[PDB]
Design a protein around this motif. Structure first.
Motif, PDB file in Angstrom:
ATOM      1  N   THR D  28       0.802  -1.100   0.050  1.00 53.58           N
ATOM      2  CA  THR D  28       0.117   0.051  -0.079  1.00 53.58           C
ATOM      3  C   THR D  28       0.913   1.269  -0.192  1.00 53.58           C
ATOM      4  N   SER D  30       0.384   3.863   1.623  1.00 58.43           N
ATOM      5  CA  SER D  30       0.143   4.228   2.925  1.00 58.43           C
ATOM      6  C   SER D  30       1.114   3.182   3.810  1.00 58.43           C
ATOM      7  N   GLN D  31       1.745   2.225   3.134  1.00 61.88           N
ATOM      8  CA  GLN D  31       2.734   1.166   3.808  1.00 61.88           C
ATOM      9  C   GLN D  31       4.296   1.588   3.436  1.00 61.88           C
ATOM     10  N   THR D  33       5.171   4.525   2.183  1.00 62.10           N
ATOM     11  CA  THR D  33       5.607   5.938   2.728  1.00 62.10           C
ATOM     12  C   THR D  33       5.294   6.139   4.191  1.00 62.10           C
ATOM     13  N   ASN D  34       5.627   4.961   5.155  1.00 62.30           N
ATOM     14  CA  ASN D  34       5.277   4.876   6.448  1.00 62.30           C
ATOM     15  C   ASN D  34       6.616   5.626   7.357  1.00 62.30           C
ATOM     16  N   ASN D  35       7.608   5.713   6.767  1.00 58.82           N
ATOM     17  CA  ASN D  35       8.868   6.200   7.296  1.00 58.82           C
ATOM     18  C   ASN D  35       9.345   7.539   6.667  1.00 58.82           C
ATOM     19  N   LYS D 300       0.966  10.344   2.514  1.00 59.85           N
ATOM     20  CA  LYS D 300       0.749   9.957   3.743  1.00 59.85           C
ATOM     21  C   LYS D 300      -0.845   9.953   4.157  1.00 59.85           C
ATOM     22  N   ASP D 302      -2.553  12.549   5.296  1.00 61.92           N
ATOM     23  CA  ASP D 302      -2.478  13.393   6.505  1.00 61.92           C
ATOM     24  C   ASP D 302      -2.940  14.856   6.106  1.00 61.92           C
TER      25      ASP D 302
END
Lengths: 32, 57, 366, 339, 232, 128
Positions: D28, D30-31, D33-35, D300, D302
């Motif tokens: 994903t 979202s997976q 770009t977690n860091n 992200k 957000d």
């Protein structure tokens, strides 16, 4: 009647009359 | 027979879309991070520029 | 009203007349009356003099001329015996209602100045409220604040402690700012009556006409009042009712008050019509008394409605319930009219409260 | 009988599509770009406010020069601004009041608008006298014209309310290629950076990718629940983002051929009217009906700032080609440059 | 330099441009824009024919007030996205074929969606119940019953606030006010003071329709003004 | 993808019973007002009934009021139309339509010719 203008006139007449009374009282007493 | 023309074109349309060379999102997402991260210092809205270099003030 | 200064001049005149005049007692001046020749052994009676305003003019003052032609002296003193009791036939402890009224309106005209100085800033700080009904409101708010300011200046100059210039300006400003509050009430009444009672009124034109009417036309009849007062009967600080020079400034004011009440009826006669002719008369619940009364009440501060009750009242004596209630009514409501106008038309205004709701979010979250 | 078996055969084909799309969903966005470090809170202030429009500003387009704008309003006016010195360079009076779109030619020579009169009107800026004259009327659409974007001085692609996009030849004035496929009203376009493909979100919760030369639909993307109102390509042209009446923005990948990320807040129940990307594509600006323009971290999901400022819904939005500003029209008749 | 000269010509050009937008502001605020929105069977075509001086625009004036009426004819039947263009119009003139019983729930559902739209919840509606002469003939025939398409019509009596023309049967008046009350039942069930409904009973041969719209637009503007005062 | 798969309906004798079911997917069924529309042979689509998001603002057309009941189950993500005491007037194709946008009290073109968020439909036919 414009009540504020009437009160202006009334207040003035009242104050001027006691002024004229104070003076009269003393002078009349002196004459007596 | 009004919908024959509609049905014949739509069924062949899904055939055309079915024959595409898909890639894993694993590789698609990395190619979006790279473009956003290569152009890190070229984005005035993301990284505010000095009032010196800003034409709107 | 005859001033002390006037009375002193009249005494000086009677004194000069006495001196030109000057075994019987000899004529003399006693600082009030000129006593004539006295027959020895007789009481001498003189009419209570006309030139003393406060005297009982049907009465007499008396001296006693003794048998030797000397005026009788008070025993134990060098003073001449004189009885003026008929002349002085009650000054003591007249008037402090004026001080109670003073406190009545200084409270009201202060909250009317405190609330309206808030209201003018709020109507000016928010550029989205810059309608041309808030433009009329901002001028109306200014008129109430200046009227409260003018009254505060006028009391501190006249009543409390060449020369007469300083106070004459307080009175001519008092009489102008009081007229421009009765014509900015009429403008607001004439503007609302134009948005309804003529088909598609140019809501943004006629704005210069209203402004030169609220502030300008009062300045015409005040300058006419000042002109005639300056040339004819320039006595004192003009805080004293002349013949009829008061009607120069206050028939235009009473003209405004009858017109606003005419305009008030018209707006209520069409709120009533509109609250029946709603959705072909079906939206109406036939209990629109709740909305017609509430819309009527908010229009009373905006127009001059409490002015209609005591408008054609004559000048009555300061004692007596007709005068006491007129001043305890008019000074109680003239004071707080700027309070209710500021509350109703700026503070509990929906369109202003709505901007406050959004601007707090902008001023906090950003 | 053949019509009965064709619809179920068509349902058979999309069964392979759903298998193929989930075959490539190994991760994903979202997976991955977690860091990624957050962009942080983005403070943007209204640098200029451009006043002049009597009615709702209903569309807007920047120039390639990054300085001039165009704005369309429902009062029938069409104003070219100079956002540097907030001056009105022109003010084109339109024949029909109701204009639903506008574009500024990438060469800067022309302006095109049209709306409920079903026609696209090319306007020439560099005339003989010095005025503006209607270069052409492009007639042939059977519904309101929702968006027209220019390719060159001589080609333009137009959306329509008749479920049809079209490519015109401005010299001759007839449609060269007609794009058919959409079920409901087409609401938006966006040309490719290389100007070979373009997407089109319609009022059928479905955005299609078109090949301008070939004149046929390459890929169709679903994932939205309601009418798609805005669409923009990602700055590299390998992706795009869509707004909708279902109060969500979606990032699609063309090569992965599925949804990549969604951009929603539980507090948001109002539809997106406009969508745009910053120059790097790291932000996703989006107008709403709640009069704001939320700024999203495009990698992200957000929310990273809010462009509050408008008294009515944000009709149009646009980031400048150099990336040094964003303009936001609204139904309160005020463009606002931000930065 | 001539850098001042370029800027000088720009402020010169903005000064000229801005003084036409002021002239154009005067005429734009003066004219009242109206949206004429009905059905093919409604007979909007005859109300426009009674108006005397892609999207068909009709101009008329009453007492030196200009009106602009737009017949949006040329779009497809899906009207959820171009209906939002007309959120600034003075009124929506709704025309209904009152004689066509089968399609009246189409007209009522269309009316309900316009009334309750987010972007039209401040636009008043001048409802026109057209083809009254056909309704009169249909009712007196007694072939087609209103109760067939409206079971609420079994228990309905002519409202007291009624102004039937002379020679109208009580039958024709019940039908007239029942149809009208179906619209006013939607209008009174929401809206909460921002917008109002103005029903009229219009024939094909009627003339006083520009006057009616001039009157009802005046009432709309009056009530707009005196809600800013919080009087209504 | 927005899917509205219809169910039920078939050859029923006059005064019979039916229960139409549309299964919804690819959107949150609890945010939209669901409608029922039918198209009689030789006639255009007509609206039958609707039901609010909660299921507390039901309305019907005149012809079928008190004779049909519409119900929804947000947990199951489905919409029902109970039909009883049918007529030869009721023969038509019943489409389960969804309001175009969420959280709205207005539906604008549910009965239109080419509408996106409508079912393929079920043939309900009433005869002997």
């Amino acid at each position: 009647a414009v009540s504020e203008h009437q009160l202006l006139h009334d207040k003035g007449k009242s104050i001027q009359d006691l002024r004229r009374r104070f003076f009269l009282h003393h002078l009349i007493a002196e004459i007596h | 027979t009004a919908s024959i023309a509609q049905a014949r074109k739509l069924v062949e349309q899904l055939k055309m879309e079915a024959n595409i060379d898909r890639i894993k999102v694993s590789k698609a997402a990395a190619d979006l991070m790279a473009y956003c991260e290569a152009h890190a210092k070229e984005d005035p809205l993301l990284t505010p520029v000095p009032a010196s270099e800003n034409p709107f003030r | 009203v005859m001033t002390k200064e006037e009375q002193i001049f009249l005494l000086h005149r009677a004194q000069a007349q006495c001196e030109k005049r000057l075994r019987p007692c000899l004529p003399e001046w006693d600082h009030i009356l000129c006593w004539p020749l006295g027959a020895p052994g007789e009481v001498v009676a003189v009419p209570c003099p006309d030139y003393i305003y406060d005297f009982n003019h049907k009465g007499h003052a008396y001296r006693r001329c003794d048998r030797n032609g000397s005026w009788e002296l008070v025993p134990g003193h060098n003073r001449t015996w004189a009885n003026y009791s008929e002349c002085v036939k009650n000054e003591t402890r007249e008037r402090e209602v004026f001080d109670r009224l003073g406190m009545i309106y200084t409270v009201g005209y202060s909250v009317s100045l405190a609330s309206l100085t808030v209201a003018v800033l709020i109507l000016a700080y928010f550029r989205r409220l810059h309608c041309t009904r808030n433009y009329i409101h901002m001028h109306l708010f200014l008129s109430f604040m200046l009227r409260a300011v003018s009254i505060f200046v006028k009391d501190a100059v006249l009543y409390s402690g060449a020369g007469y210039a300083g106070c004459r300006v307080a009175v001519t400003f008092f009489l102008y700012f009081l007229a421009t509050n009765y014509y900015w009430i009429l403008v607001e009444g004439l503007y609302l009556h134009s948005l309804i009672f003529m088909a598609f009124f140019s809501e943004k034109k006629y704005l210069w006409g209203f402004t030169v009417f609220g502030w300008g036309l009062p300045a015409v009849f005040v300058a006419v009042w000042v002109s005639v007062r300056a040339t004819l009967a320039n006595t004192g600080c003009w805080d004293l009712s002349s013949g009829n020079k008061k009607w120069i400034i206050q028939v235009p004011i009473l003209a405004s008050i009858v017109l606003n009440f005419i305009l008030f009826i018209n707006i209520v006669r069409v709120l009533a019509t509109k609250l029946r002719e709603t959705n072909a008369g079906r939206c109406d619940t036939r209990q629109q008394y709740r909305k017609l009364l509430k819309s009527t009440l908010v229009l009373m501060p905006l127009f001059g409605v409490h002015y209609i009750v005591f408008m054609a009242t004559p000048y009555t004596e300061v004692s007596g319930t007709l005068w006491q209630v007129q001043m305890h009514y008019e000074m109680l409501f003239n004071s707080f009219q700027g309070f209710f106008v500021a509350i109703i038309y700026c503070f509990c205004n929906g369109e202003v409260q709505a901007e406050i709701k959004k601007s707090w979010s902008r001023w906090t979250l950003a | 009988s053949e019509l009965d078996q064709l619809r179920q055969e068509a349902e058979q084909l999309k069964n392979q599509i759903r298998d193929a799309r989930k075959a490539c969903a190994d991760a994903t966005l979202s997976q991955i770009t977690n860091n990624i470090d957050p962009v942080g809170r983005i403070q943007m202030r209204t640098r200029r406010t451009l006043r002049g429009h009597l009615a709702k500003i209903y569309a807007m387009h920047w120039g390639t020069d990054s300085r001039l704008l165009v704005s369309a309003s429902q009062d029938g006016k069409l104003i070219i601004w100079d956002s540097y010195t907030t001056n009105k360079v022109h003010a084109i009076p339109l024949r029909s009041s109701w204009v639903m779109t506008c574009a500024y030619a990438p060469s800067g020579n022309y302006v095109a608008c049209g709306g409920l009169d079903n026609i696209c009107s090319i306007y020439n800026l560099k005339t003989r006298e010095g005025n503006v004259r209607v270069s052409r009327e492009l007639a042939g659409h059977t519904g309101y014209l929702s968006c027209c974007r220019f390719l060159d001085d001589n080609q333009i692609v137009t959306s329509s309310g008749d479920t049809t996009c079209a490519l015109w030849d401005i010299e001759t004035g007839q449609q060269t290629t007609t794009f058919t496929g959409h079920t409901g009203d087409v609401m938006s376009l966006s040309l490719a950076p290389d100007t070979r493909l373009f997407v089109s979100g319609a009022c059928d919760a479905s955005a299609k990718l078109w090949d301008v030369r070939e004149g046929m639909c390459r890929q169709t993307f679903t994932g939205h629940e309601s009418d798609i109102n805005a669409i923009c390509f990602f700055p590299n042209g390998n992706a795009f983002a869509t707004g909708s009446d279902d109060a969500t923005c979606r990032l699609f990948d063309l090569r992965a051929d599925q949804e990549l990320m969604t951009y929603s807040h539980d507090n948001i129940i109002c539809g997106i009217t406009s969508v745009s990307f910053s120059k790097s594509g790291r932000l996703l600006l989006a107008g709403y009906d709640d009069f704001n323009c939320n700024v999203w971290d495009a990698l992200k999901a957000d929310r990273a700032g809010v462009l509050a400022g408008h008294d009515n819904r944000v009709s149009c939005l646009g980031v400048t080609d150099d990336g040094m500003a964003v303009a936001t029209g609204s139904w309160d008749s005020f463009l606002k440059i931000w930065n | 330099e001539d850098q001042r000269n370029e800027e000088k010509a720009q402020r010169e050009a903005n000064k000229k441009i801005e003084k036409q937008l002021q002239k154009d502001k005067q005429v734009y605020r003066a004219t009242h824009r109206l949206l004429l929105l009905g059905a093919d069977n409604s007979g909007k075509s005859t109300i426009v024919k009674q108006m005397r001086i892609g999207i068909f625009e009709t101009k008329f004036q009453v007492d030196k007030v200009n009106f602009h009426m737009f017949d949006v004819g040329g779009q497809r039947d899906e009207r959820r996205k171009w209906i939002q263009c007309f959120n600034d119009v003075t009124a929506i003139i709704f025309v209904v074929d009152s004689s066509d019983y089968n399609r009246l729930q189409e007209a009522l559902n269309l009316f309900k969606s316009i009334w309750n739209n987010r972007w039209l919840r401040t636009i008043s509606v001048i409802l026109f119940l057209n083809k009254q002469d056909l309704l009169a003939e249909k009712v007196l025939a007694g072939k087609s019953k209103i109760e067939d398409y409206f079971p609420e019509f079994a228990r309905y009596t002519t409202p007291e606030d009624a102004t039937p023309e002379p020679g109208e049967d009580p039958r024709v008046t019940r039908a007239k006010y029942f149809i009208r009350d179906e619209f006013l039942r939607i209008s009174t069930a929401s809206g909460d003071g921002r917008h109002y409904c103005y029903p009229h009973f219009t024939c094909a041969v009627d003339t006083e329709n520009a006057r009616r719209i001039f009157n009802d637009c005046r009432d709309i503007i009056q009530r707009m003004h005196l809600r800013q005062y919080e009087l209504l | 993808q927005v899917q509205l798969q219809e169910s039920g309906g078939g050859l029923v004798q006059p005064g019979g019973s039916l229960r139409l079911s549309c299964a919804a997917s690819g959107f949150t069924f609890s945010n939209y007002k669901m409608n029922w529309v039918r198209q009689a042979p030789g006639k255009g689509l007509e609206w039958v009934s609707d039901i609010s998001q909660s299921g507390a603002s039901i309305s019907y057309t005149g012809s079928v009021k008190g004779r049909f009941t519409i119900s929804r189950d947000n947990a199951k993500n489905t919409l029902y139309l109970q039909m009883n005491s049918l007529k030869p007037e009721d023969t038509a194709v019943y489409y389960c339509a969804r309001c175009p946008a969420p959280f709205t009290r207005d539906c604008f073109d549910v009965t239109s010719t080419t509408y996106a968020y409508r079912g393929q439909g079920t043939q309900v036919t009433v005869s002997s």
